[PDB]
Ligand binder design. Structure first.
Ligand code: NA
Length: 57
């Protein structure tokens, strides 16, 4: 889970580009070309609309 502290970077999420197994999302950050793992449990709460756009895919 330590593998997935992307939020601590303090950037704004933009878009989930992937997932893997505790469920994790590869999160892409706004305006940069960078992505890091964050825990789905935590993304649900911090950026629910973005979590949801990932599912409608
Ligand atoms: Na959101």
């Amino acid at each position: 889970n330590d593998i997935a502290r992307g939020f601590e970077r303090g950037l704004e999420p933009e878009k989930i580009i992937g997932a893997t197994d505790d469920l994790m999302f590869l999160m892409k950050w706004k305006d940069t070309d960078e992505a890091d793992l964050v825990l789905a449990k935590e993304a649900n709460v911090k950026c629910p609309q973005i979590v949801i756009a990932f599912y409608e895919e």
